[PDB]
C-alpha cells in the first residue's frame, strides 16, 4: 500500500496513493512533544486542560505554559513544537487584531481557526516550507451559537467539536470522552472541569497535583478568557477526589 | 506654422508639404523633408513641436518595416493609421505627449487610395482632402470649391498650385517652395517642386 516515488517523503507532493506522507510526519511531531491536552464544552462554559511538566526546578513555572490568550474573549492551548506553537499564536493574534480593525468586531473562533488552517494549508501545499508541527485548540463564546471549541491541525482540518483531545494520548482520551458524551449530561461548569481533569488523569494515570496541570475557561457569565490559579485548580481537584 | 495638404482621388493620393524649418525669427532651412515613407506605397506627413515629429515618425517607420520583415507583406494604410493613432493616443495621457499633427496617405491594391488625418489629440478621420497648419484655413475653401471625386491628377496639381499661390499672396509666413509627390499603384512618385519666385 504505502508506496513511494520521487521526493514524496522528503517534500509535500503526492505519493502514488496521494497520501502526502510529510503531513503525517508533522502529525507525529505533535506527539513528539510528549504532552496531552483536552477540551470540552458545556451548555454555559468551555474549558481546556493540559499537563504542566516542569523538567527542571530552575525553570520559572510562570513562563512555561501552553495556554495563550489570543484576545480578551479567546484563549487557546497549543500542543507540539513549542516554537511553531508560539509562531501560530502570534499569527492568530495578528489576524484577530486585523479582523477587528477591518470589520469592526471581535473575530469568531470559527473564522480564526479557518484562517489559521488556510495558513497551514499554504505550508502543506508549497514545497519550500514544512508544515508547522503543532495543533491549536480554540475556545470562545459566540453570542448566537454559544460556547465553541475548534481544533486546527497541520493539514488544515478545522472542525468543531463537543469535546477534543490532542497529544500523545489523543486516541485514549477521545475513547474516554466518546463514552461520556454518548451518555446524557447537563455539562455545567464544575461538571465540565471534572470531566476534563478525569479524562487527563485517567489516560495518564497521573493523579495530578495542583502544579501538575493548567486550565483555562470561558463562561457566558464571564466571557473573558481566564487561566485559573493553583488555588482554584486545587479546589476543583479536592472536590474530584472526594466524590 | 508648417503646412501640409492632401488630395485623394479615384486612383491616386496627392500630398504636399512646405520645405521650411524655422526655429524663431530666422528660417534655418529651405529644403526640409517632412515626408517619411513607412513602406513602398504609404507616406506619413508629420508636423508640430520639434523633436516629437521625427521621434514619432521614425518609431512608426520602424514598426511598419518590422511588420514587413516579419510577416512578408506590408500593412495597409488603414492599419498603419490605426497603429500610429494608438501609439499617439496612449502617449497623450502619459508623461511624454507627442504634440504632432499628422496626415497619412497610401494606396491599397484592394481598397484603393486613402488619406487619413489625425490631430495631436489622435482623433482619426478618413477624408477626401485635408490640410494642416494655419494655411489650411485659407486653402480648404479652395478645395471645397474646385474639388471633384473624379479629378484627374493634372487637375489635382493645378488645384494644388492654386492653393499654394493663394498662400503666397495672402499668408503672412514665407513658404516659397513646396515638396510634392504622388502615391498610386505603381508606388510613390516624386514630382517637380512647386516654387514661387
Amino acid at each position: 500500500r504505502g508506496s513511494s516515488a520521487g521526493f514524496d517523503r522528503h517534500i509535500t507532493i503526492f505519493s502514488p496513493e496521494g497520501r502526502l506522507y510529510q503531513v503525517e510526519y508533522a502529525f507525529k511531531a505533535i506527539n513528539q512533544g510528549g504532552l496531552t491536552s483536552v477540551a470540552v464544552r458545556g451548555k454555559d462554559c468551555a474549558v481546556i486542560v493540559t499537563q504542566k511538566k516542569v523538567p527542571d526546578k530552575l525553570l520559572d513555572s510562570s513562563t512555561v505554559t501552553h495556554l495563550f490568550k489570543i484576545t480578551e474573549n479567546i484563549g487557546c492551548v497549543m500542543t507540539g513544537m513549542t516554537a511553531d506553537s508560539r509562531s501560530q499564536v502570534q499569527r492568530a493574534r495578528y489576524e484577530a487584531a486585523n479582523w477587528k480593525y477591518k470589520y469592526g468586531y471581535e473575530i469568531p473562533v470559527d473564522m480564526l481557526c479557518k484562517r489559521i488552517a488556510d495558513i497551514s494549508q499554504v505550508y502543506t501545499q508549497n514545497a519550500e516550507m514544512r508544515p508547522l508541527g503543532c495543533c491549536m485548540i480554540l475556545i470562545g463564546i459566540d453570542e448566537e451559537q454559544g460556547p465553541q471549541v475548534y481544533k486546527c491541525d497541520p493539514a488544515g482540518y478545522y472542525c468543531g467539536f463537543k469535546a477534543t483531545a490532542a497529544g500523545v494520548k489523543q486516541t485514549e482520551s477521545t475513547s474516554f470522552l466518546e463514552k461520556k458524551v454518548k451518555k446524557k449530561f447537563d455539562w455545567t461548569f464544575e461538571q465540565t472541569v471534572e470531566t476534563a481533569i478525569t479524562c487527563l488523569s485517567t489516560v495518564l494515570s497521573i493523579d495530578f497535583k495542583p502544579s501538575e496541570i493548567e486550565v483555562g475557561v470561558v463562561t457566558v457569565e464571564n466571557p473573558k478568557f481566564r487561566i485559573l490559579t493553583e488555588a482554584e485548580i486545587d479546589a476543583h481537584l479536592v472536590a474530584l477526589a472526594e466524590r | 506654422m508648417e503646412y501640409l495638404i492632401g488630395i485623394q482621388g479615384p486612383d491616386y493620393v496627392l500630398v504636399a508639404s512646405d520645405r521650411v524649418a524655422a526655429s524663431n525669427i530666422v528660417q534655418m532651412k529651405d529644403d526640409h523633408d517632412k515626408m517619411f515613407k513607412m513602406s513602398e506605397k504609404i507616406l506619413l506627413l508629420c508636423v508640430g513641436e520639434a523633436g516629437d515629429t521625427v521621434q514619432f515618425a521614425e518609431y512608426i517607420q520602424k514598426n511598419v518595416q518590422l511588420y514587413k520583415m516579419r510577416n512578408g507583406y506590408e500593412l495597409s494604410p488603414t492599419a498603419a493609421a490605426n497603429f500610429t493613432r494608438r501609439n499617439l493616443a496612449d502617449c497623450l495621457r502619459s508623461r511624454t505627449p507627442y504634440h504632432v499633427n499628422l496626415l497619412l496617405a497610401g494606396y491599397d491594391e484592394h481598397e484603393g487610395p486613402a488619406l487619413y488625418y489625425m490631430d495631436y489629440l489622435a482623433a482619426l478621420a478618413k477624408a477626401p482632402f485635408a490640410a494642416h497648419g494655419y494655411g489650411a484655413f485659407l486653402t480648404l475653401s479652395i478645395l471645397d470649391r474646385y474639388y471633384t471625386p473624379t479629378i484627374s491628377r493634372e487637375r489635382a496639381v493645378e488645384l494644388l498650385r492654386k492653393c499654394l499661390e493663394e498662400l503666397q499672396k495672402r499668408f503672412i509666413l514665407n513658404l516659397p517652395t513646396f515638396s510634392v509627390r504622388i502615391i498610386d499603384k505603381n508606388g510613390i512618385h516624386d514630382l517637380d517642386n512647386i516654387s514661387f519666385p
Binding site: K102, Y103, G104, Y105, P108, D110, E143 | -
Partner: protein, 222 residues
C-alpha cells in the same frame, strides 16, 4: 439630491429623491438613489454618482464574501469601516457621501459617511442639497421610538421639503424599510409632482422628414 434616514422602534427607514442632474438640467427623473449592500443593509448615496455606485458595489461584494464565508448575516459597522477606510485612503477625491442603514443582531444602526472618511452614528441624518431642509423637518418632528407609519410619513415629509425647496432634488420619493424580519423597498412611494398633460398634439405624419439615404439590413432569427 436629498437622502434621509431614520431609526424607528424595530428597524430603519431610508428615503431619497429620484432627480439626477448634469449641471442644472435634469437628466434622469426616476433615478434609484437607494443601493443594495446586503439583504439586511441598504445605503443611499449622494455626491459624485459614479463614486457612490462603484463604492457601494465594491462593499456589497466584500460583504457578500464576508457573509457567506462566516455563515451569518453581515453587520453594519463592518460596512461603515470598509467605507471609511477606503475613502480615507483616497483622501476625499472620490466624492461619495453616503447614509448607510441596516439591521443586524445587535439592532438597527444608521451611519452617515462623508467623502473624506468621517462617520457619525445618528438616529436621523440627511445628506445632499436638500439636507438642510430635511434636517429642519427632523429636528422639528422627530421623536424617539416612532412607529413605522409615523416614521414613513416623517421621512416622506422631509424628502418632500427637500424637493419643493431645492432645485437639485425632485421628481419622486423612494422609500426603503428595513426591519429585523422584512424589507419593503418602495420605489414609487409618492408622486408629489407630475408632468401636466400636453394640450396640443404635435405628432408628425410620415414623410415629414426628408431622407438622403436608406439601407435596410435583415436580421436572421431562429
Amino acid at each position: 439630491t436629498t437622502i434621509a434616514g431614520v431609526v424607528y422602534k424595530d428597524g430603519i427607514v431610508l428615503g431619497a429623491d429620484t432627480r439626477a442632474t448634469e449641471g442644472m438640467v435634469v437628466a434622469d427623473k426616476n433615478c434609484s438613489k437607494i443601493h443594495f449592500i446586503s439583504p439586511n443593509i441598504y445605503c443611499c448615496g449622494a455626491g459624485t454618482a459614479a463614486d457612490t455606485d462603484m463604492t457601494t458595489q465594491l462593499i456589497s461584494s466584500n460583504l457578500e464574501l464576508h457573509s457567506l464565508s462566516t455563515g451569518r448575516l453581515p453587520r453594519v459597522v463592518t460596512a461603515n469601516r470598509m467605507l471609511k477606510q477606503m475613502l480615507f485612503r483616497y483622501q476625499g477625491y472620490i466624492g461619495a457621501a453616503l447614509v448607510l442603514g441596516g439591521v443586524d443582531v445587535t439592532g438597527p444602526h444608521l451611519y452617515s459617511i462623508y467623502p473624506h472618511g468621517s462617520t457619525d452614528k445618528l438616529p436621523y441624518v440627511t445628506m445632499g442639497s436638500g439636507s438642510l431642509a430635511a434636517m429642519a423637518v427632523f429636528e422639528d418632528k422627530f421623536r424617539p421610538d416612532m412607529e413605522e407609519e409615523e416614521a414613513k410619513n416623517l421621512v416622506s415629509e422631509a424628502i418632500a421639503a427637500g424637493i419643493f425647496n431645492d432645485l437639485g432634488s425632485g421628481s419622486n420619493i423612494d422609500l426603503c424599510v428595513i426591519s429585523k424580519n422584512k424589507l419593503d423597498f418602495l420605489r414609487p412611494y409618492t408622486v408629489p409632482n407630475k408632468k401636466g398633460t400636453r394640450l396640443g398634439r404635435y405628432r408628425c405624419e410620415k414623410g415629414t422628414t426628408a431622407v438622403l439615404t436608406e439601407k435596410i439590413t435583415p436580421l436572421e432569427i431562429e
